[PDB]
Design a protein around this nucleic acid. Sequence first.
RNA 1: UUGUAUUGGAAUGAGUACAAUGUAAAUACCUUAACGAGGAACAAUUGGAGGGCAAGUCUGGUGCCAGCAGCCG
RNA 2: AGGGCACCACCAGGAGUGGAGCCUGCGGCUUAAUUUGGAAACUCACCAGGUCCACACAAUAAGA
Lengths: 66, 48, 239
Amino acid sequence: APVDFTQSPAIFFKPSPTDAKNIELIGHGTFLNADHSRILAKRAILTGHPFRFHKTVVTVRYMFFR
Amino acid sequence: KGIVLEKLGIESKQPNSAIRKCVRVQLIKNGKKVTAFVPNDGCLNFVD
Amino acid sequence: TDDFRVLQAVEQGSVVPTPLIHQISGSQSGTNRAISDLAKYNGIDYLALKTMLNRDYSVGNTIGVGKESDIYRVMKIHRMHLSRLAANKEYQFMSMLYSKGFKVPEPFDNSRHIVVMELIEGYPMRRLRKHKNIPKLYSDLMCFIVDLANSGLIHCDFNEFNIMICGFVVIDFPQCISIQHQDADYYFQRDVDCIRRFFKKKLKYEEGFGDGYKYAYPDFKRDVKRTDNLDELVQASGF
RNA sequence: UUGUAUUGGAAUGAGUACAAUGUAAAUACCUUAACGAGGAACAAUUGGAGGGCAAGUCUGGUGCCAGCAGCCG
RNA sequence: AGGGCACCACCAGGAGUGGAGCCUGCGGCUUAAUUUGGAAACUCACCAGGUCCACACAAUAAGA
């Protein structure tokens, strides 16, 4: 978005013409900074079932199929 | 009474380990500059 | 690795009390990143590898194991304090010889009682049976002993267990001694006799030495002329 | 005769109010006809529970961080 | 620091092992698996492919 150099307060809403004031208020906050070095990582989780147990190894099912 | 200049974190003395939240303040009646602690955790969001 | 390197570098400050981990080492994040890596005789081995891992690009594979050292393009590791000393003696001793014309494996690096060397192509001499030109080979093993004696050193056990296949190369130098030692001739004649036995028994063979040269095989009081005194750079034995 | 929980009549002012009293004239206090309790919702808070210093081996969460802490922690 | 003890320490020695071929245990490699740490079936725990098998509501039976 465009930059603001005054750290203005911020209000967040979504339009909703069914409402008596046509607006749905969601939250509030503040403009912090411009910073491209912010890295966001999306994350996925695979999961599996351990089912046989030995003193130094475990074997796992259903996480993979080939 | 004073005016808030900027927001700071202060590293605690050893052996404790924490970054504690403080502000720089200029006193209205003197112009002298001071650092103050902000109690109660998330309360730092109330000051700017 | 600075959180681990300093964790080792502080270890010279000496048991070890718990407060040494709080104020002997250098803070937020630093007091946690050590656990984040640290959570995943032995430690001075399992972690001490880190120096090579940083300064040295393949982990390779296992190759050999021995009573006092283990072996894994080839890496050698010694077996709490003295192990760092032994490695340093070996590294500089080899390095020194290789700077002369001697046919030994080239050293590349040494750190923290770990040494890295060239990997030899050949196969052990003890199972050689059919070399296409044994007469020149006999000559050149003999001449090699003369060179070392000139430079000031006597191998203790110059025999087929430590020669690999002039195409030969000599692979280790346990318990070498200087030419000044009181028993120098007695060990010298063993090496000559040991090499003669092999060529007679298996190969049937029996300026140079042997046939085509005017002197049969070297002798301790011949062709030894104190050329280089390399036994002073490493005080091998006998001052 | 003492505890713990289903049920019943009694008692009263906070408040509102005709009147009189009070007062320079008033407001309020004292007095009083009528009205005014069943989660009597006509619902007491402010700080604490390691020690100093009265009072929890209770139960869920969290990750030396957020935090607590006059001092020892 | 001293002092004492021991052929899992030495001294005087014996038989040796380490070098050859083969048997066997462990690690590593390979593999669908070479299970885990006196094995041809079973043992068996491993691999490939096959059969077979609660309680509480609504419908059903003199043939469930």
